Amino acid sequence: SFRFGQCLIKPSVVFLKTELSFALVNRKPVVPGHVLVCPLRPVERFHDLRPDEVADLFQTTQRVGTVVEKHFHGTSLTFSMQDGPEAGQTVKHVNVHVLPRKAGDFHRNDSIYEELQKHSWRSEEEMAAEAAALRVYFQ
Amino acid sequence: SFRFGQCLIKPSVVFLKTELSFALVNRKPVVPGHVLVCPLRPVERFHDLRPDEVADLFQTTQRVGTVVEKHFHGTSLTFSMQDGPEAGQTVKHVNVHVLPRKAGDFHSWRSEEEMAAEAAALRVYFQH
Ligand code: NA
């Protein structure tokens, strides 16, 4: 029922839906709690978004980061958007990466962008369990 | 004089100011056109920003990203925010990293005038 690029996202992996955005759990997370926030409209490039979509996309991203930071016991967050083919985008749909960070997770803080640019899978039940847990934070 | 963490930024290196945000050039760019977008209010963590500040900050980031992609002849952009110490934050102030990207780009400070030159160039793009 949800669109992510050329693929249909199962609802079970989505834990937030706004008027214009939505957040989903990752099939291959770089760290625990690595989630994605996207516009509901499938546009490839960040510059394709209207102003209200930009506001919604990142107000949502703000709320999602604070939730995943607490749930996965992080003390900081990495936000990253790979806006276009030459920045690592695989799925042709604007998406914001939200990663909880803990002291010592990467000995080098700058090696989490190597891992993001290289975007074996988690199970449907494992992903739906994680999303269902995160849903509790938004009521 | 603009405030970025504990640093006072000279206006000469700032190329955009909105009602709630401002953009400045980098003293230590990772690639050509690596710029920074910040709230005018010095808050350390992203969650401390009000909603109107979040919107303004990233509507600006969209504008700034479109400009640096053109000027530095990029074909994509990397947006990145190191929100907190365990995410790499050096300056205790929310800032979005905006980087023009080129095919094959990946696979010790700048001078004031070199930075003031770059800021002067980017300002022209917001003159319409
Ligand atoms: Na910072």
UniProtKB/Swiss-Prot annotation, chain A:
Residue positions binding substrate: C7, N26, Q82, G88, Q89, T90, V91, H97
Location of this chain's protein in the cell: Cytoplasm; Mitochondrion; Nucleus
Organ and tissue specificity: Low levels expressed in all tissues tested. Phospho-FHIT observed in liver and kidney, but not in brain and lung. Phospho-FHIT undetected in all tested human tumor cell lines.
Tagged with keyword Repressor: no
Pfam families, A to Z: HIT
Motif (Histidine triad motif): 93-97
InterPro entries named among the record's database cross-references: Dinucleoside_ppp_hydrolase, FHIT, Histidine_triad_CS, HIT-like, HIT-like_sf
GO biological process terms on file: diadenosine triphosphate catabolic process; intrinsic apoptotic signaling pathway by p53 class mediator; negative regulation of proteasomal ubiquitin-dependent protein catabolic process; purine nucleotide metabolic process
Record key words, sorted: Apoptosis, Chromosomal rearrangement, Cytoplasm, Hydrolase, Manganese, Mitochondrion, Nucleotide-binding, Nucleus, Phosphoprotein, Transcription, Transcription regulation, Transferase, Tumor suppressor
Function: Possesses dinucleoside triphosphate hydrolase activity. Cleaves P(1)-P(3)-bis(5'-adenosyl) triphosphate (Ap3A) to yield AMP and ADP. Can also hydrolyze P(1)-P(4)-bis(5'-adenosyl) tetraphosphate (Ap4A), but has extremely low activity with ATP. Exhibits adenylylsulfatase activity, hydrolyzing adenosine 5'-phosphosulfate to yield AMP and sulfate. Exhibits adenosine 5'-monophosphoramidase activity, hydrolyzing purine nucleotide phosphoramidates with a single phosphate group such as adenosine 5'monophosphoramidate (AMP-NH2) to yield AMP and NH2.
Disease: A chromosomal aberration involving FHIT has been found in a lymphoblastoid cell line established from a family with renal cell carcinoma and thyroid carcinoma. Translocation t(3;8)(p14.2;q24.1) with RNF139. Although the 3p14.2 breakpoint has been shown to interrupt FHIT in its 5-prime non-coding region, it is unlikely that FHIT is causally related to renal or other malignancies. Associated with digestive tract cancers. Numerous tumor types are found to have aberrant forms of FHIT protein due to deletions in a coding region of chromosome 3p14.2 including the fragile site locus FRA3B.
Subunit (UniProt): Homodimer. Interacts with UBE2I. Interacts with MDM2. Interacts with CTNNB1. Identified in a complex with CTNNB1 and LEF1.
Protein name (Swiss-Prot/TrEMBL): Bis(5'-adenosyl)-triphosphatase
Species annotation: Homo sapiens (Human)
Gene expressing this chain: FHIT
